[PDB]
């Protein structure tokens, strides 16, 4: 397999991602370097074999019975269409630039892929039926990263990572109207990686980064270059946007990627690339500091370095490269993807 | 007399505007004067020479070891909140006739304290609790169930939330919704008689120009004083001295 944007060759898988069936008993992991996706039996840890997909996928996801595993192939520019039980790739639908993600919706009748192309904006649209793209869904800007579904079903969030700008924002779409209803704009952020919704459906969980571009490039201290920060957003209308930092002082977490939350949302899991860890959130006590801050506040609260200690439950070492994170239907474990050390770190979660 | 005791001055909605922090006993039959509150006329400085009312309410008789009134148990208000007065309790009292004034307050068995769980609580749930969940800050539902912190289930939802801190201010002053032995500086106080009532804010911003609502007319006059009362006690949650039966810390 190749290295990503070289021509060079390697022989390992090096995962990209990760995802886990309903049922929760297999995980499908996304090998960027490898072509292909291996499957893992959640109960013995083991690899149960490795099906081949198109050049370099970056993402999957699960069919609700569990019966289908939609890839994203990111070079080919295509989506795999790939059955679990067969082991065996049986459709490529072609999209529009780059899927960085794919979800596939509550009944099941549907899956959306982002396009995450520089100049590209689309969101496609495929009928899990047809087996093929629809329509395409254009954002507000371009480069959307990932999109996420909500609880309701009715609305689908895009982050939109945009090269070349300070101001990145968030596209809500309503599924049965097809196009955008509202623009929310995260202010001096960079680098967005995901997106989440809490199990009640009132916020939404985005990792990015926050650069001071407008300053001098000096010392590395206090965050004076970048400083990495998560970002809840209330779902109601006219609801706040809240920065919040991942960083002590002396501490902090390069590059945060992954996401997984909770089912009944009492923990926000973040995969961080830079610093090779997975940091846990206590969302009670992020969401009850959201609830309780005005906007003035929590904009001024984004800059303390030591306010993450308060809702901050624990940062748990991991392989190399963990771009990616899922949990389990009984949220008792977290899994995180490790690209360099080609591995899967197994967590056992506070849950009890 | 023989019993630990302080005090505070009022002003007419009865709220403490200063404290004296300390512990004071009087022997029996005695009694003790004072220029002033904290002025120095027992630290550092001679008594200012002042001719007052009270002196002639003290001991006018001379079949009387004292005429100066007992310390009465409750408060008569207005309409509008004012101070209309003091009013007797039943604790009214072998016994001889060494005293003009009716004998009060020298029951300790009936002594009475506010206790938040016995008090104010129950208010809190009926007129409160309603509107305020875990989406409106500050929590007050919940009820008397404990709340467990860093491995510790002491008081209810309304308790830790009322008690809370606040950033920049000095906790030893207040948190966010009570100032300990200061209602008149209590942000809560503030909210509930729907006016500035001091001259120390408890915030920059108290009064939202956009979706307020007035909480005066939320509580009656009792109600809303009780809980003025219990902030002017220290605001405490357990305020019977031993294990009783109200809910708290068990292990
Ligand atoms: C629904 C009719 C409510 C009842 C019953 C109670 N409160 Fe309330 N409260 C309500 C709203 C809509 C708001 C928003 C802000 C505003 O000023 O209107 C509040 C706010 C408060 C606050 C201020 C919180 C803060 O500024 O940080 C306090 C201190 C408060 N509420 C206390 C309180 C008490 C003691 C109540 C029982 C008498 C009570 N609330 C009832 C709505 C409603
Ligand atoms: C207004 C309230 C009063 C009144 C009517 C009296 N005192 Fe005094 N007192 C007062 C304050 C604010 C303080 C200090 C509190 C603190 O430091 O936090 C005190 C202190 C005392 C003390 C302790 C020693 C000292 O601080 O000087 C004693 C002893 C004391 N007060 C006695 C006292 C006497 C005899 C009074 C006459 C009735 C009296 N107090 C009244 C405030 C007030
Ligand atoms: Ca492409
Ligand atoms: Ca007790
Ligand atoms: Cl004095
Ligand atoms: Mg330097
Ligand atoms: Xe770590
Ligand atoms: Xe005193």
Same mark, same amino acid.
């Given at each position: 397999?190749?290295?990503?944007?070289?021509?060079?060759?390697?022989?390992?898988?090096?995962?990209?991602?990760?995802?886990?069936? %309903? !049922? &929760?008993?297999? *995980?499908?992991?996304? $090998?960027?370097?490898?072509? =292909? /996706?291996?499957? +893992? @039996?959640?109960?013995?840890?083991?690899?149960?074999?490795?099906?081949?997909?198109?050049?370099?996928?970056?993402?999957?996801?699960?069919? %609700? !019975? &569990?019966?289908? *595993?939609?890839?994203? $192939?990111?070079?080919?520019? =295509? /989506?795999?269409? +790939? @059955?679990?039980?067969?082991?065996?790739?049986?459709?490529?639908?072609?999209?529009?630039?780059?899927?960085?993600?794919?979800?596939?919706? %509550? !009944? &099941?009748?549907?899956?959306?892929?982002?396009?995450?192309?520089?100049?590209?904006?689309?969101?496609?649209?495929?009928?899990?039926?047809?087996?093929?793209?629809?329509?395409?869904?254009?954002?507000?800007?371009?480069?959307?990263?990932?999109?996420?579904?909500?609880?309701?079903?009715?609305?689908?969030?895009?982050?939109?990572?945009?090269?070349?700008?300070?101001?990145r924002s968030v596209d809500f779409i309503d599924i049965a109207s097809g196009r955008v209803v509202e623009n929310r704009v995260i202010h001096e952020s960079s680098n967005l990686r995901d997106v989440v919704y809490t199990?009640?459906?009132?916020?939404?969980?985005?990792?990015?980064?926050?650069?001071?571009?407008?300053?001098?490039?000096?010392?590395?201290?206090?965050?004076?270059?970048?400083?990495?920060?998560?970002?809840?957003?209330?779902?109601?209308?006219?609801?706040?946007?809240?920065?919040?930092?991942?960083?002590?002082?002396?501490?902090?977490?390069?590059?945060?990627?992954?996401?997984?939350?909770?089912?009944?949302?009492?923990?926000?899991?973040?995969?961080?690339?830079?610093?090779?860890?997975?940091?846990?959130?206590?969302?009670?006590?992020?969401?009850?500091?959201?609830?309780?801050?005005?906007?003035?506040?929590?904009?001024?609260?984004?800059?303390?370095?030591?306010?993450?200690?308060?809702?901050?439950?624990?940062?748990?070492?991991?392989?190399?490269?963990?771009?990616?994170?899922?949990?389990?239907?009984?949220?008792?474990?977290?899994?995180?993807?490790?690209?360099?050390?080609?591995?899967?770190?197994?967590?056992?979660?506070?849950?009890? | 007399?023989?019993?630990?005791?302080?005090?505070?001055?009022?002003?007419?909605?009865?709220?403490?505007?200063?404290?004296?922090?300390?512990?004071?006993?009087?022997?029996?039959?005695?009694?003790?004067?004072?220029?002033?509150?904290?002025?120095?006329?027992?630290?550092?400085?001679?008594?200012?020479?002042?001719?007052?009312?009270?002196?002639?309410?003290?001991?006018?008789?001379?079949?009387?070891?004292?005429?100066?009134?007992?310390?009465?148990?409750?408060?008569?208000?207005?309409?509008?909140?004012?101070?209309?007065?003091?009013?007797?309790?039943?604790?009214?009292?072998?016994?001889?006739?060494?005293?003009?004034?009716?004998?009060?307050?020298?029951?300790?068995?009936?002594?009475?304290?506010?206790?938040?769980?016995?008090?104010?609580?129950?208010?809190?749930?009926?007129?409160?609790?309603?509107?305020?969940?875990?989406?409106?800050?500050?929590?007050?539902?919940?009820?008397?169930?404990?709340?467990?912190?860093?491995?510790?289930?002491?008081?209810?939802?309304?308790?830790?939330?009322?008690?809370?801190?606040?950033?920049?201010?000095?906790?030893?002053?207040?948190?966010?919704?009570?100032?300990?032995?200061?209602?008149?500086?209590?942000?809560?106080?503030?909210?509930?008689?729907?006016?500035?009532?001091?001259?120390?804010?408890?915030?920059?911003?108290?009064?939202?120009?956009?979706?307020?609502?007035?909480?005066?007319?939320?509580?009656?006059?009792?109600?809303?004083?009780?809980?003025?009362?219990?902030?002017?006690?220290?605001?405490?949650?357990?305020?019977?001295?031993?294990?009783?039966?109200?809910?708290?810390?068990?292990?």
């Amino acid at each position: 397999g190749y290295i990503q944007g070289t021509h060079v060759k390697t022989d390992l898988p090096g995962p990209f991602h990760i995802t886990m069936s %309903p !049922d &929760g008993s297999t *995980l499908f992991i996304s $090998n960027q370097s490898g072509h =292909s /996706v291996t499957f +893992v @039996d959640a109960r013995t840890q083991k690899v149960t074999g490795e099906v081949a997909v198109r050049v370099q996928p970056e993402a999957s996801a699960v069919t %609700p !019975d &569990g019966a289908f *595993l939609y890839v994203c $192939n990111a070079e080919s520019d =295509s /989506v795999s269409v +790939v @059955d679990i039980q067969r082991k065996q790739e049986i459709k490529e639908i072609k999209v529009g630039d780059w899927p960085s993600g794919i979800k596939i919706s %509550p !009944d &099941g009748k549907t899956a959306y892929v982002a396009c995450s192309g520089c100049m590209w904006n689309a969101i496609d649209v495929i009928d899990t039926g047809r087996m093929e793209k629809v329509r395409s869904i254009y954002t507000s800007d371009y480069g959307p990263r990932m999109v996420e579904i909500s609880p309701d079903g009715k609305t689908l969030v895009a982050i939109l990572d945009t090269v070349g700008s300070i101001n990145r924002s968030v596209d809500f779409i309503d599924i049965a109207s097809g196009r955008v209803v509202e623009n929310r704009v995260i202010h001096e952020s960079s680098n967005l990686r995901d997106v989440v919704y809490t199990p009640d459906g009132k916020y939404i969980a985005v990792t990015h980064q926050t650069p001071k571009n407008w300053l001098p490039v000096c010392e590395a201290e206090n965050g004076q270059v970048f400083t990495n920060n998560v970002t809840i957003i209330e779902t109601k209308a006219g609801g706040k946007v809240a920065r919040l930092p991942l960083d002590d002082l002396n501490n902090y977490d390069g590059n945060p990627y992954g996401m997984a939350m909770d089912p009944k949302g009492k923990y926000l899991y973040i995969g961080v690339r830079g610093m090779h860890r997975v940091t846990i959130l206590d969302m009670d006590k992020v969401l009850g500091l959201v609830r309780s801050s005005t906007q003035e506040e929590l904009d001024y609260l984004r800059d303390d370095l030591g306010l993450v200690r308060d809702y901050l439950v624990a940062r748990v070492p991991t392989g190399l490269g963990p771009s990616s994170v899922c949990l389990s239907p009984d949220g008792k474990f977290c899994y995180a993807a490790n690209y360099f050390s080609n591995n899967v770190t197994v967590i056992r979660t506070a849950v009890d | 007399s023989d019993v630990p005791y302080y005090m505070q001055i009022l002003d007419d909605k009865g709220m403490s505007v200063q404290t004296a922090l300390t512990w004071a006993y009087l022997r029996p039959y005695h009694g003790r004067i004072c220029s002033g509150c904290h002025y120095g006329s027992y630290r550092g400085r001679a008594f200012k020479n002042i001719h007052a009312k009270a002196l002639y309410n003290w001991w006018y008789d001379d079949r009387s070891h004292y005429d100066s009134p007992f310390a009465f148990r409750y408060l008569k208000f207005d309409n509008d909140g004012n101070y209309k007065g003091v009013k007797h309790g039943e604790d009214v009292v072998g016994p001889s006739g060494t005293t003009s004034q009716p004998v009060e307050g020298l029951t300790l068995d009936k002594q009475r304290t506010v206790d938040f769980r016995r008090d104010i609580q129950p208010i809190l749930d009926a007129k409160c609790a309603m509107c305020h969940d875990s989406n409106n800050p500050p929590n007050l539902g919940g009820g008397l169930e404990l709340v467990s912190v860093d491995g510790i289930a002491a008081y209810s939802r309304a308790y830790n939330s009322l008690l809370e801190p606040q950033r920049g201010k000095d906790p030893n002053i207040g948190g966010k919704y009570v100032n300990p032995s200061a209602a008149i500086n209590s942000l809560l106080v503030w909210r509930l008689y729907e006016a500035e009532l001091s001259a120390n804010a408890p915030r920059e911003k108290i009064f939202p120009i956009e979706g307020r609502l007035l909480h005066n007319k939320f509580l009656t006059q009792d109600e809303r004083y009780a809980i003025v009362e219990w902030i002017d006690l220290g605001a405490q949650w357990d305020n019977i001295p031993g294990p009783d039966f109200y809910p708290g810390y068990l292990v």
